[PDB]
Amino acid sequence: KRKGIILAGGSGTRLHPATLAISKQLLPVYDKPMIYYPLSTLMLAGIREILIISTPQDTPRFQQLLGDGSNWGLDLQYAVQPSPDGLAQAFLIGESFIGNDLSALVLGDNLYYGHDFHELLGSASQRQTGASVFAYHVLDPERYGVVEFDQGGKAISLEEKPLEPKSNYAVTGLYFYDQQVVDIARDLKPSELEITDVNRAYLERGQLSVEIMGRGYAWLDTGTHDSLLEAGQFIATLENRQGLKVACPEEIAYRQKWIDAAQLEKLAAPLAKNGYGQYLKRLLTETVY
Amino acid sequence: RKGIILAGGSGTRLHPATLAISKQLLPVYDKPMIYYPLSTLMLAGIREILIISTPQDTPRFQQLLGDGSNWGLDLQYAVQPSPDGLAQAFLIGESFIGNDLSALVLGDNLYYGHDFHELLGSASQRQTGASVFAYHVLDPERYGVVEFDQGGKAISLEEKPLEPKSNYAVTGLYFYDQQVVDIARDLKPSGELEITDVNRAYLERGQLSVEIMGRGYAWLDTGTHDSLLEAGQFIATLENRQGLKVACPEEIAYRQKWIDAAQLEKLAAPLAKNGYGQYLKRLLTETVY
Amino acid sequence: KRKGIILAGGSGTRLHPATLAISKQLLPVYDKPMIYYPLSTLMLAGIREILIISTPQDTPRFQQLLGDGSNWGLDLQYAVQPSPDGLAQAFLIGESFIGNDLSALVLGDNLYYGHDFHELLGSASQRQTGASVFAYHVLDPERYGVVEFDQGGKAISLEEKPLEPKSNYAVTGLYFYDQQVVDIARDLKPSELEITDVNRAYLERGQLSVEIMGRGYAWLDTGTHDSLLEAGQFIATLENRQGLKVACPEEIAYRQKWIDAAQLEKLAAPLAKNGYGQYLKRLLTETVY
Amino acid sequence: RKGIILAGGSGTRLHPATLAISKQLLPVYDKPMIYYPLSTLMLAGIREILIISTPQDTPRFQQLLGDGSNWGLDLQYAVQPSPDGLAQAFLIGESFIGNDLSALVLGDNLYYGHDFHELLGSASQRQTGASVFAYHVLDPERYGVVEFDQGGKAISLEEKPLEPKSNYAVTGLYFYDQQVVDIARDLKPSGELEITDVNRAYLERGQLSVEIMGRGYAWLDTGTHDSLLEAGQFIATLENRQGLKVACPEEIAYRQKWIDAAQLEKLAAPLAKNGYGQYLKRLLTETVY
Ligand SMILES: CN(c1c(NCCCn2cc(CN)nn2)n(Cc2ccccc2)c(=O)[nH]c1=O)S(=O)(=O)c1ccccc1
Ligand SMILES: CN(c1c(NCCCn2cc(CN)nn2)n(Cc2ccccc2)c(=O)[nH]c1=O)S(=O)(=O)c1ccccc1
Ligand SMILES: CN(c1c(NCCCn2cc(CN)nn2)n(Cc2ccccc2)c(=O)[nH]c1=O)S(=O)(=O)c1ccccc1
Ligand SMILES: CN(c1c(NCCCn2cc(CN)nn2)n(Cc2ccccc2)c(=O)[nH]c1=O)S(=O)(=O)c1ccccc1
Ligand SMILES: [Cl-]
Ligand SMILES: [Cl-]
Ligand SMILES: [Cl-]
Ligand SMILES: [Cl-]
Ligand SMILES: [Cl-]
Ligand SMILES: [Cl-]
Incomplete structure (x- = not known):
């Protein structure tokens, strides 16, 4: 059993004033709230039990959007991040939710697309010891956790936002963990509690799997107003x-057969006037390979 | 002249994007949608503005904009319990309007162009009757449509006609004298109190000014996911x-000299880390013609 | 041995006046001529011997862009289509070029992207008897050749631009053929010599492989000014x-090791001032997985 | 006043996109780039226009535009053997200009906005000295930069300064009296004959009019692959x-009544199948204010 966490704790003041009224992860990417994308990612990895971490202010808005997840065959729980004290804080806030189970952390503002993405998720989810992360070639690796590889393609170092990156390979905001992660997180000292420190802990134990997410996958940037707009145009196209x-x-x-035709039809009903509801109706009758 | 921004529900049209929060709090590129119509009223020289929204979203608009005193405005707030037509704005706004002239702008309408201040100025200076703007569009059937005679005089208004008489749509920007509240009180639901019925009332009294908003102006569509995205790309460019x-x-x-250098500097301070705050700082030192 | 054909015979007057001065397939998609995309597709399928079919007028422009291909480890030949009399005419014009070899036809205005695209091409290229085509779910199947499948997912019919498509599965502009194709093409009667008639001939002989190109692949539309622009934004992102x-x-x-480091460095030299040349230089030193 | 469009080489800057054909024959959305500056000269009331291009591309411009008689224009053609600066336009154009007033527009400059005809009209009516336009840009170091004194008088011009004195760039639209050819003949290479040197000559004689092109006008960038794409999206919107x-x-x-209904109908005929021809047909019957 693997449990999911979505970290949707806003973006401080970075995207103000756009994000003054509402959290980043409730802004739409084209036709659906940003959080639908990472939620869909956890669902494709076969994860049905998911903790959503958000600000005290925005938790009710996430709850109004997603409910308890029962309408989608999920179990959604909610926790608050009073203060954005690093991504690794997710494991302390989520400690009781995780219990003795395996976990996956996804950032609430990360968008993924491509062929055999389910297989890339599957390989990480099936490794039931250690940690699995994904490395993706980017233009601006200095914005991210950067993986250095040896001549043999083995991961040998992780640096958080290095001014002189060792490679163009950034760690994506999708992390698979065994039962060691909560304890590793509790022993961290602030630099913020860094996810890269959690991942380096697994690397030093020789328990970090770094799989390449190929150039044939889209890992999209929602870090700026410009990149948010590009992500919208990308999905729309x-x-x-x-x-x-x-x-x-x-x-x-x-x-995934987590809901049946009858449940899907019920979900379509209140959206039947717009393209989204009409899309859900068409799914009942059409064969899609 | 007092201003009203109608930022009510678009029902379920843009769901699920608008499930968590009102359309007019979503960003267009770098700023909340409502900043655009607010800026329109401000350019028309209007400082006293009523913001009408859903019961749920009024507090979010209040958290974003406050009482307006930080921007040299006087902002008041009212709720639209149910979206029963745009003309309802004048009943909700009746006490706010009192015996004064008014301007209604839709919370999801974006305008851009040269001498826009003069186009607003000409409507605002006409202290009797109503002033509206006609703009050539591809899809006039979505709007209030103006028909002109061979002499270019406005002779009919139709709300979303199946067979438009012209390609000239009425924009979501309306200037009114002291007759508007009384005209609105006498309207019967079509099940909506139609702004086009208010405008037809003024036309039949020969008191409707219909000025052409030229093709050199951008009047942007935020009615669909596609058009919302284009509006973002348009502002970003x-x-x-x-x-x-x-x-x-x-x-x-x-x-407009509604705030001084000292007040602007104070507004920049909390945004100083991002481009928006840096922009406000640059405004203190740069000459812009 | 499989030989390649790129059909780049313009677009008649469909995209006029944009295409009045130059052929569609020489227009850029973001940073490179459209024809670079289908050429790159044939190259990824391991094809080095390629016939470019274009108008008499534009052949010299294609030749000025691409030369004989020797700079890229290719052998490029050129043939003219005096009149656009259907896609299947490619096999009559290309008859002597093809000889007794296997062939692949790609349309000069088709763009493909995704993970394991090389494997999807590989599976079609390794089938050394019959024909292989790809089916892709589209919104507007009525614009294309449409594949109908039985309950078992076997292809049972092909229709060219049906007013009432049997499925949403369009045949992409990428076709693999054995030595039968030229003879099949010579026996066709004008409806234009239809590629769908060539593909139906193989289907009736039970020699048509129809592989699904999954939703995780991008097959991009350059049929309209709107879709050409979206294709540009898609690649740019x-x-x-x-x-x-x-x-x-x-x-x-x-x-593919068709050229070495020394040859690539020579190709970079004349482009060294712009991002494209700088990109080719970076390829000499960087490990990309 | 006679018009010149300089549509010469951008060297290798946009290669390989521009390897096959000149930048100014590439489409911006639905029409060749050169249609935009041509339309600019036409809106300024100029019917006699010299098109300067590379030796290779002159015939392509001639095939696109002819002698202009179909549009009520008189188009002549000249070649720029080598891109040795924009001021060379006046030496190549010397015989075409004769004893008349002139306007130079760059073949890759796009303008849009309300009362653009009046902005052109004011420069065109000034029958002595030179008129240019200053536009606030983010990246003034890419352009000719105007410095203003506290009174808003133009006091210096610098070509691509490392330390711009202002954010005000000179647009690629220049109005000149009969002095320009002689001023151009006396210029020494910087290795380019600089238009900024021509404009500084008029400034030093106190005969340079610098009008502000307001923020309500769009002056669009086609200098990069990114900006070319944005220009397409801007026009499309x-x-x-x-x-x-x-x-x-x-x-x-x-x-402008340079052609009549009958001539326009004839121009529509060969385009009648596409949206552009259908647009020209609609113009015959529709009243557009
Ligand atoms: C485009 N993709 C995608 C989809 N593509 C995944 C196809 C590959 N596949 C087969 C299976 C069978 N277990 N699972 N995945 N599918 C299909 C799907 C099929 C079966 C189960 C779940 C989803 C889908 O419904 N929505 C999708 O959005 S995707 O790149 O894998 C994706 C992207 C972002 C979030 C979640 C999935
Ligand atoms: C681009 N425009 C615009 C601006 N352009 C308006 C220039 C015309 N103008 C001159 C003056 C001088 N009293 N007022 N307006 N200005 C300048 C401005 C100057 C003085 C007072 C108010 C605004 C501005 O600050 N922000 C702007 O966004 S605009 O097209 O007219 C506009 C469009 C939509 C909302 C608000 C403004
Ligand atoms: C993004 N892709 C792509 C690339 N992706 C393909 C990676 C998968 N792969 C491994 C191999 C090893 N034979 N071949 N392909 N590669 C890498 C590449 C690696 C080895 C050989 C040829 C190209 C590339 O250089 N340019 C590319 O543009 S792609 O989706 O397969 C593609 C898209 C359009 C045309 C050609 C290829
Ligand atoms: C949108 N503009 C524009 C147009 N707008 C200009 C309207 C202002 N105007 C009124 C008049 C009446 N003499 N002339 N110009 N017009 C109208 C037009 C009417 C009469 C004569 C010439 C053009 C047009 O046909 N095409 C246009 O493209 S524009 O912003 O001024 C423009 C921008 C760049 C090139 C050419 C025009
Ligand atoms: Cl890949
Ligand atoms: Cl106008
Ligand atoms: Cl700034
Ligand atoms: Cl797929
Ligand atoms: Cl302006
Ligand atoms: Cl039309």
Whole structure:
């Protein structure tokens, strides 16, 4: 059993004034709230028990959007981050939720797309000891956790936002952990409690799997107003080309058989007037390979 | 002249993007949607403004904008329990309007262009009857449509006609004399109190001024996920080209001399880390024609 | 041995006046000529001997861009289509070029992206008898050749631009053929000589492989001014995110070991001032997984 | 006043996109780039226009535009053997200019906004000295930069200064009296004949008019792959919103009464199948204010 955490603790003042009224992870990417994308990621990894961590202020808005998850065959719980004291704090806040189980942490503002993404998630989820992370070639590795590889393609170092990156390989905001993570997190000293320190702890124990997320995958940037807009245009282009949605949670739950035709039809009813509800209706009758 | 921004529900049209929060709190590029119509009223020289929103979202608008005193405005708030037409704004706003002239702007309407201040000025100076703006669009059937005679006189208004008489849509910006509240009270639901019925009342009295908003102005659509995205790209292109912002309320208040250098500097302080605060700081030292 | 054909015969007057001065397939998609994308596709399928079919007018422009291909470890030949009399005409024009070999036809305006695209091409290229095509879920199947599947997922019919498509599965502009194709093409009667008639001929002989190109692949539309612009924005988003190019022929030739470090350095020299040349230089020193 | 469009080489800056054909023949959305500056000269009331291009591309410009008689223009052509500065336009154009007033526009400059015809009109009516336009940009170091004194008088011009005195760039639109050819003949290479040197010559004689092009105008960048794409999206957003075209030369000629209904109908005929021809047909019957 692997449990999911979505860290949706806003973005401080970075995207103000756009994010003054509402948390970053409730802003739409094209046609759906940002959080639908990482939620859909956990769902594709087969995870149904998910903790959403947000600000005290925005927890009710996340709860109004997503409920307890029962409508999508999920169990959603909620926890608050009073102060953004690092990503690794997710494991202390989430300690009781995690218990003795395996976990996956996804950032609430990370968008993924591509062929065999389910297999890339599957390989990390099946490793039931140590930690699994993904390395993706980016233009601006200095913004991220950077992985250095030896001539043999083995991961040998992790640096958080290095001014002189050793590679162009950034660690994506998707992390798989065994039962050691909470204890590793409790022993961290502030630099913020750094996720890169958690990942370096596993690396030093020789228990960090670093899989390449290939250039054929899109790992999208929602860090700036410019990149948020590009992410919107990217999803819009795919969806209007295909007549298929990216990270429609109702669709993923239906295809995982976590909800049946009758439940999906009920979810379509109140959205029947717009394209999203019409999309859910079409899913009941169409064969999609 | 007193201002009203109608920032009510779009029902379920943009769901699930708008499930968590009102359309008019979503960003267009770098700032909340409501900054654009607010900036429009400010450019028309209006400082006393009623913001009408859903019962749920009124506190979010209040948290974003306060009483307006920081921007040299007087902001008041009212709720629209149910979206029963745009004309309801004048009943909700009746006590706020009192015996004064008024301007209604829709909370999801974006305007841009040269001498926009003069186009607003001409409508605002006409102290009797009503002034509206007609703009050539591809899809007039979505709007209030103006029909003109061979002499270019306005002779009919139709709300979302199946067979539009012209390609000229009425924009979501309306100037009214002291007759508007009484005209609104006498309206019967169509099940909505139609702004087009208010405007037809003035037309039949021969007291409706219909000024052409030329093709050299951008009147932008935020009605669909596609058009919301285009509006973001449109503002981003102008702002990144110019190093100047469209509809920055702090800037407009400063340039109208509604706040001084000292007040603007104080507003910059809490945003000093991001581009928006840095922009407000640059405004103190730079000459912009 | 499999030989490649790129059909780049313009677009008649469909995209006029944009295409009045130059052929569609010489228009850029972001940073590189459209034809670089299908050329890169054939190169990824391991094809080095490629016939480019274009108008008499534009052949010299294609020749000025691409030469004989020797700089990229290719052998490029050129043939003219006097009149656009259907896609299947490619096999009559290309008859002597093809000889007794296997072939692949790609449309000069088709863009592909995704993970394991090389494997999808590999599976079609290794089938040395019959024909292989790809089916992709689209919004507007009525614009394309449409594949109908039985309950078992076997292809049972092909229709060219049906007013009432049997599925949302369009045949992409990428076709693999055995030595039968030229003879099948010679026996066709005008409806234009239809590629769908060629593919139906193989289906009726039970020699048509239809592989699904999954929703995790991008098959992009360059049919309209709107879709051409979206294709540009799509590539720009991926390339600026990754610091890696999509369909850089110099890169693909280098990674296939069709050219060495010394040849790549020579190709970089005349482009050294711009980002494209700087990209080719960085390829000499960087490990990319 | 006679017009010159300088549509010469951008060297290798946009290679390989511009390897096959000149920048100014690439489309911006739905029409060749050169349609935009041509439309600019036409809006300034200029019918006699010299098009300067590379030796290679002159025939392509001639094939696109002819002698202009179909649009009520007189188009002549000249070649720039080597891109040795913008001021060379006046030596190449010397015989074409003769004893007349002139306007130079860059072939890759796009303008949009309300009363643009009046901004052009004011410069065109000044029959002595030179008129240029100053526009606030983020990156003034890329352009000719105007410095103003406390009174808003222009006091210096610098070409691509490392330390810009202001954020005010000179746009690629220049109005000149009969002095310009002689001023140009006396210029020494910097290794380019600089337009900024021509403009500084007029400034030192106190005969340079520098009018502000306000933030309500769009002056668009086609200097980079990124900015070319944004220009396309910008025009597409306006045209799809309005159902009206920006810089349709047939429309501008018709509205200036340089061609009649019968001539416009003939121009529509060969384009009748696509949206551009259908647009020209609609212009014959529709009243547009
Ligand atoms: C485009 N993708 C995607 C989808 N593509 C995944 C196809 C590959 N696949 C097969 C299976 C069978 N277990 N699971 N995944 N699917 C299909 C799906 C099929 C079966 C179960 C779940 C989802 C989907 O419904 N929505 C999707 O959005 S994706 O790149 O894998 C993705 C992207 C972002 C979030 C979640 C999934
Ligand atoms: C780009 N525009 C605009 C601005 N352009 C307006 C320039 C025309 N103008 C001159 C004056 C001088 N009294 N007022 N307006 N200005 C300048 C401004 C100067 C003085 C007072 C108010 C605003 C501004 O600060 N922000 C702006 O966003 S705009 O197209 O007219 C506009 C569009 C939508 C909302 C608000 C403004
Ligand atoms: C993003 N892709 C892509 C690339 N991705 C392909 C990676 C998968 N792969 C491994 C191999 C080893 N034979 N070949 N392909 N590669 C890498 C590459 C590696 C080895 C050989 C050729 C190209 C590349 O250089 N340019 C690319 O543009 S892609 O989706 O397969 C592609 C898209 C469009 C045209 C050609 C390829
Ligand atoms: C949107 N603009 C524009 C147009 N807008 C200009 C309207 C202002 N105007 C009124 C008049 C009446 N003599 N002339 N100009 N017009 C209208 C027009 C009407 C009469 C004569 C010429 C053009 C047009 O046909 N195409 C246009 O593209 S524009 O911003 O001024 C422009 C920008 C760049 C090139 C050419 C025009
Ligand atoms: Cl890949
Ligand atoms: Cl106008
Ligand atoms: Cl700034
Ligand atoms: Cl897939
Ligand atoms: Cl202005
Ligand atoms: Cl039309």
